[PDB]
Nucleic acid binder design. Structure first.
Ligand SMILES: [Mg+2]
Lengths: 230, 188, 278, 118, 54, 137, 136
RNA sequence: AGAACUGGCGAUGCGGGAUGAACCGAACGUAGAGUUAAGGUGCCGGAAUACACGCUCAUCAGACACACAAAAGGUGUUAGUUCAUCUAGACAGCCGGACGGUGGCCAUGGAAGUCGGAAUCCGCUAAGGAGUGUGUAACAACUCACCGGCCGAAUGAACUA
RNA sequence: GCAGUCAAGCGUUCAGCGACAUUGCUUUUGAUUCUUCGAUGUCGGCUCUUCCUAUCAUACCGAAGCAGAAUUCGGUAAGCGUUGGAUUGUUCACCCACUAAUAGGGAGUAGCUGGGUUUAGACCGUCGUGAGACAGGUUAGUUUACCCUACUGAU
């Protein structure tokens, strides 16, 4: 131990007498083994084998193309080189969300026959001073687990995307009563803290906030994605 | 495309004769005789000049042509074994525990006995197949020579002899003890 | 722990680890659920799947973290050896990255379980479970290089020598090929190359012997040159720090023959230069 | 072969087959040397170390040694009298059997033969 | 030796109707999405005659 | 959704003078326990934070040398980086470090009582569930 | 048999189920041992693990020195009090069941053992026999 | 999903698709003879184990809807399309060369083509790439791209069905 | 998930679609995690039979720095096993004791069941001017067979 003992043993004693023949025969048989596996594997193992074969073939083709290319043979400053980088909304006419969905009837009392309550089962922004009211007064319920604070906004320019706090919701289509509720409901326009991106308009009036539109459905995702409206 | 007919040529040396039945092939020569039942192959034989035999398959497919080729190869191997014979040399290597090899006899089976392999107390007996003779080499320390007329029998015996000494559960990168086929050649 | 940290659990690369975890989650847990089942059943099934995946990833990361020797505050000699061999900065950075990935996986699993507890449809729960699995897969994929580096360093550390500094040990010093390996082989039973080429031993070699019923261990080292330590290889630094940290009594070997073409004057100059360590 | 066929061992080597272009070039060179030099010799060197071949080539800078495929050299020298490049050149081409081998030089025949003997 | 279960090949006409409806929908979807020569073959012994006629 | 110049409109633009005033106020203002906050007056706090510091966290060493370069089959890191410039400095920094490590080990061993479990092989009994309250979900 | 025990052990009556209390038979200061688990016990539905003479068990000190409280340590039963068939052809039992606390290697903590020590336990545990002044 | 047109079922028997509200056939009095639809002609089951060309060996094919799993992968098979080399000896098999400037420049304990970074320049050829891979601390040695010598004739590469 | 690069390919007639890879996303020094935020609906257990492998262990093997011990993954493998317990100021889990192991799932079971649907009782808070119910909470409150089949035995 305490060293490359296997290497020293090989250099002093060598491999097995049939080791070379065994390795050569296994290498020769590898083609038949691959062919048999391509036809015998089942139970989703065939899917993985086919995917790996596809990846290997693509990699080999790309390597061959690169080798052939080798055999054939914007104006950044010195301190920035060798470094990494109509008024229509991007998503008009979003799918309409029914009023029956997103409002789960919640039943209360020993005899659950006076529900009178509604729960919003979609992500919503509830401001900074939310402070739930008494139980007897609250009708619409938005669980805290569904309350989002920071939204992922992608900059159309520079291809850079940053995680920024949500400021407010301005225009949610489909009965903007939901806008008042603050539901995201992909297709909504929300204010975002653009201060991080350092956008400055003419006149020295640095912009720390701007509009943005959510591009992903938060119902089926654990994150909020939006496209910055430059 | 189901070729109309494909044939191959088998060369029979003057020193041996090969009588063939419907599909049973018998080879006779100085060293001995061999037989093989090829009734499952469905091929035809035909003499031309008493020294060459042509095996042909009419309306045979690619697989049938391959079977014809392997039949020709088997016939050639049998002829070579009958004429020259085959000689297999096997060497056993040990690091600490010497390997004791002896040809014991019980009821005429003539098992090959290997003892003290890697210090194991178990006695390994490898039966000797028909038509193959095993003799310990002389002037080549730690070597055993297997000879016979049939390639299949000698090869299977050598494979079994080397496999019976399998190193189980130990790192093959360190334990080099075992039995290996050092060289394959003809008796002549 | 100390003394031959050989029992570190092997760690597979990022791709292999992710594949193993996903296969285990798919196999051990049930995979059959139907839309006709109550929404509670589907929610429980998907939450259980996500929790199982998170638990598997957490267990793997915890095992990897525990296995390693925790280079900090182990021992000056062992700590310095690890720093010289595995680039202690990079080793600590990789292990901290693994620990951070573990916490990220825990947070992702908890958040996704909380979100999925409010699931309202089979498709929504399936999408949430897929999102959690994809987040875990991306976190694992981000760990590609550190896992590969840690596998190699784990192999090396398992194959490293295990000397006890507190014990009475010998140490051989001098120019390469002066006879350090030969002396170690002769004095005690050990497997060390005794070839005459420049650097026969590329690392430390240990050999035990008994004198007057007391256990002793001899240590052989590649050796050092007349360099002023401003520029030096890790091989020479290993010997330098072994001399510095170890209480061992050091023996300075010399060869007056034409071999070891650093003349007697060079040997004496090296001895004088290393005198502070002596 | 629809399937179950041999697979070529593809390797990313830098050299590529010269093709028929090299053969045509050697053919033209042989036909030019047949008239550019006063004497022609057929050298049967089955195998030789490349340094030895270069030493032989540089032994006389005032001469040219042509080698390559035997068939190409034979065709350049002519296979029949009906198309031989030079009179009786078919006879010389008929004599090549080994790994030839075609030396063109204006040096004295006796000197060349003595050098080859020594 | 301990062969496992085999998938039944029975038609299960409920599946017949389901597949018929699915195919009818798919054909309509494909139709809606729709709105939104090799020359002389080789190996022919008399391919030259085509060029002569041209 | 109807197109408009808003949404691509400017809403919350701030001026430099206001930013400077708020930055000064952050360090000037102090809180009083007898007074409680009612409104935070939504502000770009990001542009006002990042006060002066003198730490300069450790540089990204991985960028200069990757994991493979530090160690592996290639292992181009043939020499230690910034190692002690002299043998005397190495001895001075190692002899005292050994004593410090011994003192730290003694201090840690003063507590261990896991040593009894390690030696005698016994283990502490399971913590009673009653002592885990009130910490339920 | 398990670690520490030497040789094979023949089955005897199991008179010490989990949760049983047996008087301490060593001078370590413990008074009685509360058995929480039995080493080498079988796995079966609804079957409570049970110990016997010479078996190694994990038990907590219900009474005795405060230092020994709240911690579970291995113990070896020296008395059973339940009749068991000896191969010699006699059924015997002790006045009261008792055990001695020991380490996983079977080493004795107390320097002496009080009261009779079962023959099976003494034979199966060399350290117990060496620390036993009375056997049977 | 919202509409317009067009049939059936409801109120509908009968033969077929094993079994059926929508599928095919089809004009419902009681009878005799004959010819047919759709479906079938190895038995249950009335009718050719009929004739002719091919396609498939499946360690749970096939007789399964035409639609989701479905993008592809098989040194499993049959037939085709497009490009290449070829008696100026086609592919594959055996033996020889695989040079010299040269151990090319940076670091180096060791780095000679094959641990790492920029080059990757030129002479002689039939050919030699500052090197395709195995291995030595270091070369050495083995081997490949190509070429050369022996037999000889079709062979190779990508796609379609 | 969204926002981008490349194209093995498809192709308004070969501008558009597009496989495998790939960048931004959600404190680099194992340091902490003292967040653990609404499931309006139950789950969890006593006896007991069978079945699936997507195999925890036993059986046979390959690949792993597999020197040993020991450990990881993978191939076949359901023949046999997969346990004794604390916790309801909750128990959609959990800890520690052994054992080779304490793997995941279906048939569920008016056979028994504790939480839950709970009915005229009763006690504290909210609403309402009231009858009363609720955001709560606490508490006291049919049931087979001798008929047929199914199974175990017997003429
Ligand atoms: Mg040496």
């Amino acid at each position: 131990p305490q060293n490359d003992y296997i290497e020293r043993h090989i250099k002093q004693h060598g491999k097995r007498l049939d080791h070379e023949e065994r390795k050569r025969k296994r290498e020769a048989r590898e083609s038949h083994k691959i062919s048999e596996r391509a036809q015998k594997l089942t139970g989703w193992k065939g899917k993985q084998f086919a995917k790996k074969r596809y990846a290997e073939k693509v990699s080999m083709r790309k390597k061959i193309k690169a080798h052939e290319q080798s055999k054939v043979k914007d104006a950044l400053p010195t301190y920035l080189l060798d470094r990494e980088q109509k008024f229509s909304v991007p998503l008009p006419k979003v799918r309409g969300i029914s009023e029956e969905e997103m409002f789960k009837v919640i039943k209360t009392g020993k005899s659950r026959s006076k529900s009178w309550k509604r729960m919003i089962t979609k992500h919503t922004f509830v401001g900074e001073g939310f402070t739930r009211r008494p139980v007897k007064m609250e009708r619409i319920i938005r669980p805290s687990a569904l309350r989002q604070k920071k939204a992922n906004v992608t900059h159309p320019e520079l291809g850079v995307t940053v995680f920024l706090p949500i400021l407010a919701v301005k225009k949610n289509p489909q009965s903007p009563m939901y806008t008042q509720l603050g539901v995201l409901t992909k297709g909504t326009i929300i204010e975002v803290n653009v201060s991080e991106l350092g956008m400055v308009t003419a006149g020295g009036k640095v912009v720390w906030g701007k509009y943005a539109q959510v591009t992903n459905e938060p119902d089926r995702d654990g994150c909020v994605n939006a496209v910055l409206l430059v | 495309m189901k070729y109309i007919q494909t044939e191959q040529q088998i060369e029979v040396p003057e020193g041996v004769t090969v009588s063939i039945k419907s599909r049973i092939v018998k080879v006779v020569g100085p060293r001995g005789t061999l037989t093989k039942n090829l009734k499952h192959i469905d091929v035809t034989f035909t003499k031309v000049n008493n020294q060459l035999i042509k095996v042909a398959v009419h309306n045979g497919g690619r697989k049938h042509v391959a079977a014809l080729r392997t039949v020709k190869s088997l016939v050639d191997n049998m002829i070579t074994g009958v004429t020259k014979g085959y000689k297999y040399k096997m060497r056993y290597v040990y690091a600490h525990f010497p390997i004791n090899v002896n040809i014991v006899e019980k009821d005429g089976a003539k098992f090959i006995e290997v003892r003290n392999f890697l210090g194991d107390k178990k006695i390994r007996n490898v039966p000797v197949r028909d038509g193959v003779t095993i003799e310990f080499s002389t002037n080549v320390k730690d070597e055993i020579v297997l000879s016979g007329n049939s390639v299949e029998d000698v090869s299977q015996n050598a494979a079994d002899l080397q496999q019976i000494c399998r190193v189980r559960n130990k790192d093959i990168r360190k334990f080099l003890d075992g039995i290996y086929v050092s060289h394959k050649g003809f008796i002549t | 722990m100390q003394l031959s940290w050989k029992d570190i659990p092997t760690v597979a690369p990022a791709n292999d680890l992710l594949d193993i975890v996903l296969n285990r989650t798919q196999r051990k847990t049930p995979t059959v659920i139907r839309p006709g089942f109550k929404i509670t059943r589907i929610r429980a099934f998907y939450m259980r799947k996500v929790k199982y995946t998170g638990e598997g990833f957490v267990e793997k990361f915890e095992d990897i973290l525990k296995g390693f020797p925790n280079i900090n505050d182990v021992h000056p000699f062992h700590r310095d050896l690890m720093d010289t061999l595995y680039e202690k900065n990079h080793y600590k950075i990789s292990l901290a990255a693994i620990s951070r990935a573990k916490s990220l996986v825990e947070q992702v699993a908890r958040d996704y379980v909380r979100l999925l507890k409010f699931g309202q449809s089979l498709f929504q729960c399936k999408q949430l479970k897929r999102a959690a699995l994809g987040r875990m897969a991306t976190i694992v994929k981000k760990l590609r290089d550190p896992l590969a580096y840690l596998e190699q360093v784990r192999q090396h550390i398992g194959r490293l020598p295990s000397i006890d500094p507190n014990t009475r040990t010998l140490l051989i010093c001098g120019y390469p090929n002066v006879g350090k390996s030969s002396f170690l082989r002769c004095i005690t039973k050990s497997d060390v190359d005794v070839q005459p080429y420049a650097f026969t031993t590329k690392s430390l070699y240990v050999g035990h012997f008994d004198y007057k019923y007391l256990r002793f261990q001899a240590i052989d080292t590649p050796g050092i040159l007349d360099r002023p330590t401003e520029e030096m290889n890790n091989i020479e630094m290993q010997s330098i720090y072994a001399i510095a940290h170890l209480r061992s009594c050091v023996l300075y070997f010399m060869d007056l023959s034409e071999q070891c073409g650093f003349t007697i004057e060079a040997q004496v100059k090296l001895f004088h230069s290393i005198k502070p360590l002596f | 072969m629809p399937r179950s066929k041999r697979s070529k061992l593809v390797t990313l080597a830098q050299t590529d087959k010269k093709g028929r272009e090299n053969k045509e070039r050697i053919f033209d060179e042989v036909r030019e040397a047949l008239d550019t030099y006063r004497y022609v010799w057929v050298l049967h060197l089955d195998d030789v170390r490349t340094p030895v071949l270069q030493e032989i080539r540089t032994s006389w800078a005032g001469s040219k040694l042509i080698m390559g495929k035997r068939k190409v050299l034979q065709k350049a020298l002519g296979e029949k009298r009906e198309e031989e490049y030079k009179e009786n050149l078919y006879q010389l081409s008929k004599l090549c059997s080994g790994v030839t081998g075609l030396l063109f030089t204006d040096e004295d025949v006796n000197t060349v033969k003595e050098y080859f003997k020594s | 030796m301990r062969v496992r279960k085999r998938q039944s090949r029975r038609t299960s006409t409920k599946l017949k109707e389901g597949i018929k409806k699915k195919a009818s929908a798919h054909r309509k979807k494909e139709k809606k999405m729709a709105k939104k020569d090799p020359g002389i073959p080789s190996n022919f012994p008399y391919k030259a005659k085509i060029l002569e006629e041209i | 959704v109807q197109p408009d110049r808003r949404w691509f409109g400017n809403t919350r633009v701030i001026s430099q003078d206001a930013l400077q005033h708020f930055r000064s106020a952050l360090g000037e203002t102090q809180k009083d326990t007898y007074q409680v906050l009612l409104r935070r007056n939504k502000l770009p706090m990001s542009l006002l934070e990042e006060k002066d510091a003198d730490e300069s966290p450790k540089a990204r060493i991985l960028d200069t040398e990757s994991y493979a370069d530090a160690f592996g089959p290639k292992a181009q890191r043939k020499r230690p980086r910034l190692a002690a410039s002299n043998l005397e400095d190495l001895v001075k920094a190692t002899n005292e470090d050994i004593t410090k490590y011994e003192e730290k080990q003694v201090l840690d061993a003063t507590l261990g009582g896991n040593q009894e479990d390690k030696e005698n092989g016994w283990t502490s009994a399971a913590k009673e569930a009653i002592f885990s309250k009130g910490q339920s979900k | 048999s398990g670690n520490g025990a030497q040789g094979t052990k023949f089955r005897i009556s199991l008179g010490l189920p989990v949760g049983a209390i047996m008087n301490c038979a060593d001078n370590s200061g413990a008074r009685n041992l509360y058995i929480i688990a039995v080493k080498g016990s079988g796995s079966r539905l609804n079957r409570l693990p049970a110990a016997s003479l010479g078996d190694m068990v994990m038990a907590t000190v219900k009474k005795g020195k405060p230092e020994l409280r709240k911690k579970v340590m291995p113990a070896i039963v020296v008395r059973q009090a339940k009749s068991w068939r000896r191969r010699d052809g006699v059924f015997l039992y002790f006045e009261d069941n008792a055990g001695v606390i020991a380490n996983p290697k079977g080493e004795m903590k107390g320097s002496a053992i009080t009261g009779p020590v079962g023959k099976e336990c003494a034979d199966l545990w060399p350290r117990v026999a060496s620390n036993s002044g009375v056997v049977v």
